[PDB]
Ligand binder design. Structure first.
Ligand SMILES: O[C@@H]1[C@@H](O)[C@H](O[C@@H]2CO[C@H](F)[C@H](O)[C@H]2O)OC[C@H]1O
Ligand SMILES: [Cl-]
Ligand SMILES: [Cl-]
Ligand SMILES: [Zn+2]
Ligand SMILES: [Zn+2]
Ligand SMILES: [Zn+2]
Ligand SMILES: [Zn+2]
Length: 374
C-alpha cells in the first residue's frame, strides 16, 4: 500500500521473520558492506541467508594456480555464522570471472587452439583435474559452514544449446559432471548442490535446462536443486510462466532457490533514468504490484522453494546500474521511450531501483506489498 510510510527499514517489521516458515530471505553482499553500519543493521534485521556478490567467484578465489585468496570469503562466512545466517557459495564453476590459467596447455597456449585429438584429450583431462583441485580446496575449507552451493553457473546457452564456453569446448559435458561429483566427494552428503542460471523460464533454455539435469541425475551425477537468478522486469516473465518453471523442476525432485532476485524498473535493453530522484512515483507502484504478485506466487509454491535471495541489500547498490544505459536525443533530453528517437547513449550511467528498500534505507512501496498478508 502507498499510504504506508517511508519509514526506516531498521524500524520496519523484519522481512525474514515474515517468511520464516516458507523460505529463507537472503541478500548478495560485498565485504566492504560488513564495514558499513547501515548494511550491518539491514542484514541483521531483515535477512537470514547470505551470498557473496563477488569474492567467492573463480577469479576471486584462485587468480593464479596455487594462489588461494580466502580472506574476503572468510569475512562473509564469519559474519553469517556470527548472526546465524545460511550461506550460499557463488559459484564453483563459471564462464565469467574465471582466470585464464585454467584453459592453457603445458606450453601455455589456449587449449581451445589445439587441433591434435591426442593433445585435445590431454588438455581435457588437465582441465578436469584443475577443476577438481579448485573445487577440492574450496569445499574442504567450507564444507561445515556453507550449506548451499552453486556448483555450476550459466552453463546452458540461451539458444537452447549448452553454452560453448572454454569449459565446454575443452572438456565437453564432462566438466559439468566432474563439477558436481567433486563437490559431493569432498563436502559429503550434507551440503546441497545446485545448478544456477538466468532466464530459467524462457524457452528453448528452460526445457534445455530440464533435459540436462534430468539426464545427469539419471546418470547418478549429484545435483540437488535449481537456482533461478530471476533478473526480471515489472511485466516479464509472467507469474504464470514462473510457476510453470518452478513446477517443472520440482517434479524431478529438485529444490528451487530464487538466487539473484531483482525487479527492474526498465525493459530490454534498458532505457534508464539518469538518477534515482528522476524515476516517477508511479513506477514504484508498478514495481510494488509485481512484487506482491511475485511473492504471493512464491508463498503458494513454498513447498517447492527453500530460499529467496535478492541480488543486493538496498537500492543504493545494485549491479543493475551497470546495465542502466541512458539515452539522449539531439537536444540532450533523456529518452526512456523504448522506440523513440535519440542520438547518443551513455552506457551504465543510469540508476535502477530493484529492491524493496530505497537508497536511504527507508521502506519502499514494494516492501509493504510483500510484508503484509494480502
Ligand atoms: O558486481 C558485479 C556482480 O554484481 C555481478 O554478479 C552477477 C550478476 O548476474 C548473475 F546473477 C550472476 O550469477 C552474478 O555473478 O557480476 C559482475 C560483477 O562485476
Ligand atoms: Cl555491482
Ligand atoms: Cl528515496
Ligand atoms: Zn532474523
Ligand atoms: Zn555490486
Ligand atoms: Zn527516501
Ligand atoms: Zn501481499
Amino acid at each position: 500500500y502507498a499510504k504506508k510510510p517511508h519509514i526506516s527499514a531498521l524500524n520496519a517489521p523484519q522481512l525474514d521473520q515474515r517468511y520464516k516458515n516458507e523460505f529463507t530471505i537472503g541478500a548478495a553482499v560485498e565485504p566492504y558492506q560488513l564495514q558499513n553500519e547501515k548494511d550491518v543493521q539491514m542484514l541483521k534485521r531483515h535477512f537470514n541467508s547470505i551470498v557473496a556478490e563477488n569474492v567467492m567467484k573463480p577469479i576471486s578465489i584462485q587468480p593464479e594456480e596455487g594462489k588461494f585468496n580466502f580472506e574476503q570469503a572468510d569475512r562473509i562466512v564469519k559474519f553469517a555464522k556470527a548472526n546465524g545466517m545460511d550461506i550460499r557459495f557463488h559459484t564453483l564453476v563459471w564462464h565469467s570471472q574465471v582466470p585464464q590459467w585454467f584453459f592453457l596447455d603445458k606450453e601455455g597456449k589456449p587449449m581451445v587452439n589445439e587441433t591434435d585429438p591426442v593433445k585435445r584429450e590431454q588438455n581435457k583431462q588437465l582441465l578436469l583435474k584443475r577443476l577438481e583441485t579448485h573445487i577440492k580446496t574450496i569445499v574442504e575449507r567450507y564444507k561445515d559452514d556453507i550449506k548451499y552451493w552453486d556448483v555450476v553457473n550459466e552453463v546452458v546457452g540461451d539458444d537452447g544449446k549448452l553454452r560453448n564456453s572454454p569449459w565446454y569446448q575443452i572438456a565437453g559435458i564432462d566438466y559439468i559432471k566432474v563439477a558436481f561429483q567433486a563437490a559431493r566427494k569432498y563436502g559429503g552428503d550434507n551440503i546441497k548442490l545446485y545448478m544456477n542460471d538466468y532466464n530459467t523460464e524462457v524457452e528453448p533454455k528452460r526445457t534445455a535446462l530440464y533435459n540436462l539435469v534430468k539426464q545427469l541425475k539419471e546418470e547418478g551425477v549429484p545435483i540437488d536443486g535449481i537456482g533461478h537468478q530471476s533478473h526480471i522486469a515489472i511485466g516479464a516473465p509472467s507469474e504464470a510462466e514462473i510457476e510453470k518453471t518452478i513446477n517443472m523442476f520440482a517434479a524431478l525432485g529438485l529444490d528451487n532457490q530464487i538466487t539473484g532476485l531483482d525487479v527492474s524498473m526498465y525493459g530490454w535493453p534498458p532505457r534508464a533514468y539518469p538518477t534515482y530522484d528522476a524515476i516517477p512515483k508511479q513506477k514504484f507502484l508498478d514495481q510494488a504490484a509485481r512484487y506482491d504478485r511475485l511473492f504471493k506466487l512464491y508463498e503458494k509454491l513454498s513447498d517447492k522453494i527453500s530460499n529467496v535471495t535478492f541480488w543486493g541489500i538496498a537500492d543504493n547498490h545494485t549491479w543493475l546500474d551497470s546495465r542502466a544505459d541512458v539515452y539522449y536525443d539531439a537536444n540532450g533530453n533523456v529518452v526512456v521511450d523504448p522506440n523513440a528517437p535519440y542520438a547518443k547513449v551513455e552506457k551504465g550511467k543510469g540508476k535502477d531501483a530493484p529492491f524493496v528498500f530505497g537508497p536511504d534505507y527507508k521502506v519502499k512501496p514494494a516492501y509493504w506489498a510483500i510484508i503484509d498478508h494480502k
